[PDB]
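Posting here for the record, re: 0SB.
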Amino acid sequence: LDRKLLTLEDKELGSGNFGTVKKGYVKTVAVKILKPALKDELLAEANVMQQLDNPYIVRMIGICEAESWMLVMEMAELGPLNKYLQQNRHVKDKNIIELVHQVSMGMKYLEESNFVHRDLAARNVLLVTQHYAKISDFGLSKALRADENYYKAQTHGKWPVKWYAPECINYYKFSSKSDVWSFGVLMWEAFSYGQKPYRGMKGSEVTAMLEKGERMGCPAGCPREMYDLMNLCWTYDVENRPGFAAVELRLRNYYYDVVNEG
Ligand SMILES: FC(F)(F)c1ccnc(Nc2cccc(-c3cccc(N4CCNCC4)c3)n2)c1
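Prediction output follows.
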């Protein structure tokens, strides 16, 4: 991209030991900014996003090089789903079903495109409107080789364990079905209005919970069929777990049934 066309604002949206995000520009955009191979990760993330064309996935404008390495994408003005919900706890349950269903349409596309996200969390879903969600954060994402059904992580990175399926933790095997597991945690998060999953527990304690067969409980006011769907996403054995075709069709139908009423 051509820096001269881009305009940064002083206030960062988020920061950390990784980098920072800012607002820019005719089209409004979001910019992730570095603070040796953190560039490679960003280029890798840029490479992934370039291949993705879907309404429910944040669309990349491009990458830019100046005082920092910058990834430029379309703006989702309302920001991370988890925070939004925390700040707006009277969002209707129909509207949450709407939002998660949109993530599942996005995830069915990614599944269909044979990409695995590897970081599907409520924090990584951004809101364009109250009624339009997009999937963000493809920094951990991998294209599946033509000859493979999963991505084999060759080392333990800094992993969001509370979002990760047993096969990820146990075998480092990342598939679309691993992302489905995460979708369940994401589902739980959305219906819990941006509560952190497995609160008060270390990652190793979460594994011990799940191995026993213990699951996070039904969020207050979450329809039972949506909690059922979460638990189905939390099938321990990845063979018996649904992919997003099944998951999205479950949500698709339910969201229309819930439209049927009002
Ligand atoms: F992902 C992104 F590149 F930063 C991006 C892309 C497109 N639109 C936005 N929009 C907004 C709008 C408002 C606040 C934020 C924001 C603030 C802190 C952290 C994060 N995030 C980023 C997503 N992953 C977990 C942390 C996002 N973002 C962001």
